[PDB]
Write a protein that binds this ligand. Structure first.
Ligand SMILES: *[C@@H]1O[C@H](CO)[C@@H](O[C@@H]2O[C@H](CO)[C@@H](O)[C@H](O)[C@@H]2O)[C@H](O)[C@H]1NC(C)=O
Ligand SMILES: *[C@@H]1O[C@H](CO)[C@@H](O[C@@H]2O[C@H](CO)[C@@H](O)[C@H](O)[C@@H]2O)[C@H](O)[C@H]1NC(C)=O
Ligand SMILES: *[C@@H]1O[C@H](CO)[C@@H](O[C@@H]2O[C@H](CO)[C@@H](O)[C@H](O)[C@@H]2O)[C@H](O)[C@H]1NC(C)=O
Ligand SMILES: *[C@@H]1O[C@H](CO)[C@@H](O[C@@H]2O[C@H](CO)[C@@H](O)[C@H](O)[C@@H]2O)[C@H](O)[C@H]1NC(C)=O
Ligand SMILES: *[C@@H]1O[C@H](CO)[C@@H](O[C@@H]2O[C@H](CO)[C@@H](O)[C@H](O)[C@@H]2O)[C@H](O)[C@H]1NC(C)=O
Ligand SMILES: CC(=O)N[C@@H]1[C@@H](O)[C@H](O)[C@@H](CO)O[C@H]1O
Ligand SMILES: *[C@@H]1O[C@H](CO)[C@@H](O)[C@H](O)[C@H]1NC(C)=O
Ligand SMILES: *[C@@H]1O[C@H](CO)[C@@H](O)[C@H](O)[C@H]1NC(C)=O
Ligand SMILES: *[C@@H]1O[C@H](CO)[C@@H](O)[C@H](O)[C@H]1NC(C)=O
Ligand SMILES: *[C@@H]1O[C@H](CO)[C@@H](O)[C@H](O)[C@H]1NC(C)=O
Ligand SMILES: *[C@@H]1O[C@H](CO)[C@@H](O)[C@H](O)[C@H]1NC(C)=O
Ligand SMILES: *[C@@H]1O[C@H](CO)[C@@H](O)[C@H](O)[C@H]1NC(C)=O
Ligand SMILES: *[C@@H]1O[C@H](CO)[C@@H](O)[C@H](O)[C@H]1NC(C)=O
Ligand SMILES: *[C@@H]1O[C@H](CO)[C@@H](O)[C@H](O)[C@H]1NC(C)=O
Ligand SMILES: *[C@@H]1O[C@H](CO)[C@@H](O)[C@H](O)[C@H]1NC(C)=O
Ligand SMILES: *[C@@H]1O[C@H](CO)[C@@H](O)[C@H](O)[C@H]1NC(C)=O
Lengths: 338, 177, 182, 343, 48, 48
């Protein structure tokens, strides 16, 4: 489930009129046509930050797993964070990070090595060149995993009690037995086949890692989201080379060929072409942001129901009768282990 | 906004320029204002779609939390949901989620079951809690310890497969009479 | 003039940015250079036959973080996604387009993953977010005697549960909370 | 309303050179000058503007008197102190109500303060004024609007600023305006109770972005920041071809007037540095093309005719001329555009 | 004519609307007038 | 409950320039302005 995407704060003047006083003056004749774009993109970034906050910061207290890990024979080392790893992320989130490649990280401050890029500069340097920039998310990828770890500790050490009020510690076999009771089967079937349940749980937890590793793309939603933002930015920066039915696509060239009294028509042509292109980009970003807000609200509901409790609704928390759901942090998204 | 024309006032540009030269600036103003209106209606459609999603969520919340109790945890306010009052608001609705939130709690002890005589007794509805010396059964969300009676439990097992079981005596109202 | 922002008009190709030596493999006939999105990136020197890269000038963005005006007039400036030694040397050379200047006392400099914050001082203590800075940072107005302080997120009260093989916590009491949702 | 404008304004908290009076420094006039003066009754009569302050370029004098003004856009000769001397090539004599309001509350402590700001964008000299017998310490801090008095389309060139004085038997505040964006608070009575700059302080800039006077707690994206280039390097191909200018100016048998001996010029480079440094020269007359603003012009073909004549014929070669060489041997067309070389 | 819908061509400014005596504070050099959003709102009578 | 709508595959060249070579050449000067549109409509059909 995607939760957000790359926040953008597209600027008017540098993008449309590259450091040109006369072009900026002519753009000023359009009024607050692009201040709307700046406000819309700022609102989009704020909405994505709120999306992350709603989908992750559902618990006010950062819980910690006990130093020992023996939850009635259930093996949780695959989803609990690994202390040896510097990022303090579980193998599942490590595979998630390694399987997702971001075209633009944003939190790189790439300026400084664009001159040192030596080779053909990439999308990041090009977009910094032509008026495009990317803001980083408020919640870092480390603390997002920290929220995930706190949620996991709560949901494996206190059942669903911590989702309602104070965290009440309870043995994991007892908690699983009570999930069985909530799914219409008495705790005796679990307490007689605890070994079998633990072995099946361990086998499934081991096999989902291999499925993620060997599958072509099980991160399709997040990868499609990232590719959509990257392609939108690429088209945005490609529209700068379009003639838009004028003499040339170079603002300096059109001035160095027609004196502005006869060049203002082509200046206005470039202005309206780039304004309409940016309008299309911003509208598409608004549409994708609404879709992402819907997806993240669905993810937050899935968290608040399947994670901090057991949901009686079927299919909602995976196929079959629902027992649990362990979240894992993902790049610009979340992953549920139903 | 002049929109790259002589002036932004339709009447002034008409009174200052003839029709067959002013229609160019007329078309410039037409397309600028028309693109502005298209942007406004597109943004309003975005906002209306988002508000429609929020209003569908609000209607679902009203139907479940207000006209009943929703077992969906963390849906009708934080904590175990009980009931909720809707309150009218300007261009919105305000819910008053009345939620049951637990309070002061104590570690006591727990065992998965109780073995009376070669048989494993599991609680009917509740935990097996121990003062420290005498085992008891009580509800999950409230400490109401009760004597472990046969009516309070159901027996199924052989006292050799339930890991973590402990030894205690279960009582019945039948053997006394 | 390499490693410095300068307007260039190479053999009819006009633009602005920063240039330096490159290890390109420009073919002898090649004169211009570009990238995937058709933006000029490399230009061969028409008097030295050397290859030079092309850089954006200093692109970033200024955001002002401020509390309520009725609280104080103190403000802090955020420059997104540029290195802060770079913005400092830009200020020292007085070539930054902004004319307003916030004092750089050495203490009010914070190279953050979202660009360096100037006008606020890092505190290693963690408090709840007040104004979102980005990259896990939030600024707020606090007492020392009053200034703007930038800090990492306080994710919440650190809590450790007492999970065990045979330990259970059962609520002996309860409270009724009437939460509001809008 | 909180209308936002972009206009030449005196920057807030800028530097103003306060002066005294006891010889009349020549304050430069660029992008206008803001003037102010605080006085008991009067020590100031008039101002002078313009360039070189003589009877060569049109200037301005804004002197007043007890009942009216004597402002005149004239080309007065000189006074160096009855002040004006010349009114020959002068026009635009204007008389209206005097510029000084003087009032007192039965005491001289009511020191009046006067405030005059000037600019001459597309001519149209502007004088905005507001008089108030303010506290009188010095240049005060409380804000005050600035109402226009006169608006006169001078249509001349102005570069400097001096001032005249009075007779007898703390003032002269000077400020410089810069191109800035301003935000103005308009009262319900239409007055300007407050105003905020948009390029001085980050708080001012964000206040300008949201056109308000109150900013809530939060982060606002105001603008972008760029590093303006230090230099501007222009590079072109190492070096190209050269026309035989040296070969045509350094021959040995330059044919005389009967064989005009023309070397047609094409696919050349018009390097005119040789045309300058070569020979001490004796006649360098240019008629249709400037002799310095010509390297920036590209031509299709150029014709150079090498002649040998005497000193009188050197001056004789000219459009619309007659003589033994201008009508019988080589005639220069009347519509000829070019240059002549004689060494 | 006031309190009536009329076509006006006041000093070259053409338009249609209703006019009435107002309680604004035009300064003697103010001629056109406006409202919040940059449109001719109140024009003082140049004669009376 | 609506589940889907009719899928559309609007074509730029035909809709904006009826089999006109010069018109298509001029439309090419607008960059990849409508390739975004075709991709969006394809995504809409896939979403349906
Ligand atoms: C829980 O599951 C872990 C799976 O990663 C087990 O780690 C394994 O450790 C063995 C060697 O001890 C490796 O060969 C194997 O690849 C894997 O890393 C872990 O032992 C297990 N713990 C318990 C208590 O079952
Ligand atoms: C175990 O549970 C017992 C309940 O029967 C508690 O015993 C009580 O003790 C009082 C005297 O203190 C008796 O009067 C009463 O009849 C009852 O037996 C006992 O406190 C409790 N043990 C612990 C450690 O909580
Ligand atoms: C609970 O009580 C049972 C009898 O009442 C105990 O069973 C006995 O266990 C001993 C070994 O400890 C055997 O030798 C004997 O034959 C009988 O099976 C049982 O152990 C006891 N369990 C606990 C946890 O106290
Ligand atoms: C459960 O918690 C209640 C409050 O949330 C307690 O009620 C309190 O009772 C005291 C008197 O003892 C009052 O002074 C106070 O205002 C409040 O009403 C209640 O006693 C408590 N019950 C138990 C068993 O702890
Ligand atoms: C706008 O102008 C009005 C006319 O003078 C002012 O009203 C006056 O206010 C004074 C008190 O200041 C009263 O004494 C008088 O009777 C009259 O009502 C009004 O205040 C003014 N508005 C301003 C200055 O904001
Ligand atoms: C006159 C003419 O048509 N061409 C002359 C040519 O005769 C002469 O030899 C040469 C150098 O003197 O200059 C040229
Ligand atoms: C349960 O025991 C642990 C062990 O130290 C203790 O820290 C915790 O406070 C106890 N829970 C209570 C008293 O509710
Ligand atoms: C460029 O021309 C100068 C002038 O003769 C010469 O010294 C230099 O070697 C030339 N460089 C190249 C790369 O041609
Ligand atoms: C940017 O950050 C610092 C400060 O300038 C310095 O290490 C270098 O300039 C850059 N480093 C990286 C990793 O970008
Ligand atoms: C206090 O802050 C400094 C720098 O911000 C940091 O190096 C140090 O570790 C902090 N102290 C503690 C106890 O965290
Ligand atoms: C739980 O039991 C296992 C095995 O019997 C043991 O290794 C572990 O230490 C026990 N933990 C506690 C808290 O009693
Ligand atoms: C005004 O000039 C003085 C020196 O003459 C200087 O110290 C001061 O900083 C200047 N003020 C401003 C606002 O630049
Ligand atoms: C002052 O100037 C006015 C302007 O013409 C003139 O009429 C008058 O005679 C002058 N002298 C006095 C004393 O007013
Ligand atoms: C007045 O100025 C003009 C402008 O150059 C000049 O030609 C004329 O001779 C002047 N007349 C005088 C000084 O009497
Ligand atoms: C003409 O050329 C010769 C050699 O090419 C040179 O010595 C002589 O100085 C030149 N004449 C002039 C006037 O420069
Ligand atoms: C004639 O014009 C004058 C100039 O202000 C003024 O009296 C008024 O506008 C007109 N007189 C009338 C209308 O009686």
């Amino acid at each position: 489930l995607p939760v957000s995407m790359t926040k953008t704060s597209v600027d008017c003047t540098m993008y449309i009129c590259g450091d040109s006083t006369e072009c900026s003056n002519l753009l000023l004749q359009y009024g607050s046509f692009c201040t709307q774009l700046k406000r819309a993109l700022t609102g989009i970034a704020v909405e994505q930050d709120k999306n992350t906050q709603e989908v992750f910061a559902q618990v006010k207290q950062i819980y910690k797993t006990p130093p020992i890990k023996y939850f009635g024979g259930f093996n949780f080392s695959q989803i609990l964070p690994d202390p040896s790893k510097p990022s303090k992320r579980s193998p599942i989130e490590d595979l998630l990070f390694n399987k997702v490649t971001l075209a633009d990280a944003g939190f790189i401050k790439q300026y400084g090595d664009c001159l040192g890029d030596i080779a053909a500069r990439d999308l990041i340097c090009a977009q910094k060149f032509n008026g495009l920039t990317v803001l980083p998310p408020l919640l870092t990828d480390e603390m997002i995993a920290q929220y995930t770890s706190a949620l996991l500790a709560g949901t494996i050490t206190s059942g669903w009690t911590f989702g309602a009020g104070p965290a009440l510690q309870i043995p994991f076999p007892m908690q699983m037995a009570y999930r069985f009771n909530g799914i219409g089967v008495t705790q005796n079937v679990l307490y007689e086949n605890q070994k079998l349940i633990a072995n099946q749980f361990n086998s499934a937890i081991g096999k989902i890692q291999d499925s993620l590793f060997s599958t072509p793309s099980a991160l399709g939603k997040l990868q499609d989201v990232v590719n959509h933002n990257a392609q939108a930015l690429n088209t945005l920066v490609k529209q700068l080379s379009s003639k838009f039915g004028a003499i040339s696509s170079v603002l300096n060239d059109i001035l160095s060929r027609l004196d502005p009294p006869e060049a203002e028509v082509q200046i206005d042509r470039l202005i309206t072409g780039r304004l309409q292109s940016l309008q299309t980009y911003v509208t598409q970003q608004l549409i994708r942001a609404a879709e992402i807000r819907a997806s993240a609200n669905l993810a937050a509901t899935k968290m608040s129901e399947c994670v901090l409790g057991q949901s009686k609704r079927v299919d909602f928390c995976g196929k079959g009768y629902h027992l649990m759901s362990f979240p894992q942090s993902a790049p610009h998204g979340v992953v549920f282990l139903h | 906004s002049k929109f790259g024309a002589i002036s932004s006032v339709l009447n002034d540009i008409l009174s200052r320029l003839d029709p067959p030269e002013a229609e160019v600036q007329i078309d410039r103003l037409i397309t600028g204002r028309l693109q502005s209106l298209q942007t406004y209606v597109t943004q309003q459609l975005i906002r209306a779609a988002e508000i429609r999603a929020s209003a569908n969520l609000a209607a679902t919340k009203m139907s479940e939390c207000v006209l009943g109790q929703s077992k969906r945890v963390d849906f009708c306010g934080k904590g175990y949901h009980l009931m909720s009052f809707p309150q009218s608001a300007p261009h919105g609705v305000v819910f008053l989620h009345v939620t049951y939130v637990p309070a002061q709690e104590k570690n006591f002890t727990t065992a998965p079951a109780i073995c009376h005589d070669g048989k494993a007794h599991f609680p009917r509805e509740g935990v097996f809690v121990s003062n420290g010396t005498h085992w008891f059964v009580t509800q999950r969300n409230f400490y109401e310890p009760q004597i472990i009676t046969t009516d309070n439990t159901f027996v199924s097992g052989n006292c050799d497969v339930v890991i973590g079981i402990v030894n205690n005596t279960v009582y019945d109202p039948l053997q006394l009479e | 003039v390499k490693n410095k922002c300068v307007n260039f008009n190479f053999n009819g190709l006009t633009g602005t940015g920063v240039l330096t030596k490159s290890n390109k493999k420009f073919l002898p006939f090649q004169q211009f250079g570009r990238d995937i999105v058709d933006t000029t990136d490399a230009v061969r020197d028409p008097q030295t036959l050397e290859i030079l890269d092309i850089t954006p000038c200093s692109f970033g963005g200024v955001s002002v973080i401020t509390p309520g005006t009725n609280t104080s007039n103190q403000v802090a400036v955020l420059y997104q996604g540029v290195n802060c030694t770079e913005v400092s040397v830009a200020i020292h050379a007085d070539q930054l387009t902004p004319t307003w200047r916030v004092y750089s006392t050495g203490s009010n400099v914070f190279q953050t993953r979202a660009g360096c914050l100037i006008g606020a001082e890092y505190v290693n203590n963690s408090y709840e977010c007040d104004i979102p800075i980005g990259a896990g940072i939030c600024a707020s107005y606090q007492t020392q005697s009053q200034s703007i302080i930038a800090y990492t997120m306080s994710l919440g009260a650190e809590n450790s549960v007492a999970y065990s093989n045979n330990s259970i916590a059962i609520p002996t009491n309860f409270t009724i909370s009437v939460t509001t949702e809008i | 309303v909180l209308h936002l404008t972009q206009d030449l304004f005196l920057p807030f908290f800028s530097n103003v050179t306060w002066f005294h009076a006891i010889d009349n420094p020549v304050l430069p006039f660029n992008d206008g000058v803001y003037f102010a003066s605080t006085e008991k009754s009067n020590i100031i009569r008039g101002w002078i503007f313009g360039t070189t302050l003589d009877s060569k370029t049109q200037s301005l004098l804004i002197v007043n008197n007890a009942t009216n003004v004597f402002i005149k856009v004239c080309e007065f000769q000189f006074c160096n102190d009855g002040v004006y001397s010349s009114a020959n090539n002068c026009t635009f004599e204007y008389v209206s109500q005097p510029f000084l309001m003087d009032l007192e509350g039965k005491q001289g402590n009511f020191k009046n303060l006067r405030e005059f700001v000037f600019k001459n964008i597309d001519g149209y000299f502007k004088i905005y004024s507001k008089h108030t017998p303010i506290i009188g310490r010095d240049f005060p801090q409380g804000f005050s609007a600035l109402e226009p008095l006169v608006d006169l389309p001078i249509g001349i060139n102005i570069t400097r600023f001096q001032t005249l004085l009075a007779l007898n038997r703390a003032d002269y505040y000077v400020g410089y305006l810069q191109p800035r964006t301003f935000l103005l608070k308009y009262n319900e009575n239409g007055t300007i109770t407050d105003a905020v700059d948009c390029a001085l302080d980050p708080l001012s800039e964000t206040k300008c972005t949201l056109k308000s006077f109150t900013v809530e707690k939060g982060i606002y994206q105001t603008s972008n920041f760029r590093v303006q280039p230090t230099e501007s390097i222009v590079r072109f191909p190492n070096v190209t071809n050269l026309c035989p200018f040296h070969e045509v100016f350094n021959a040995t048998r330059f044919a005389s007037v009967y064989a005009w001996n023309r070397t047609r010029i094409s696919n050349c480079v018009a390097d005119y540095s040789v045309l300058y440094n070569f020979a001490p020269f004796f006649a360098f007359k240019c008629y249709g093309v400037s002799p310095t603003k010509l390297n920036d012009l590209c031509f299709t073909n150029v014709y150079a005719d090498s002649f040998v004549i005497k000193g009188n014929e050197v001056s004789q070669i000219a459009p619309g001329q007659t003589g033994n060489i201008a009508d019988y041997n080589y005639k220069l067309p009347d519509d000829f555009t070019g240059c002549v070389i004689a060494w």
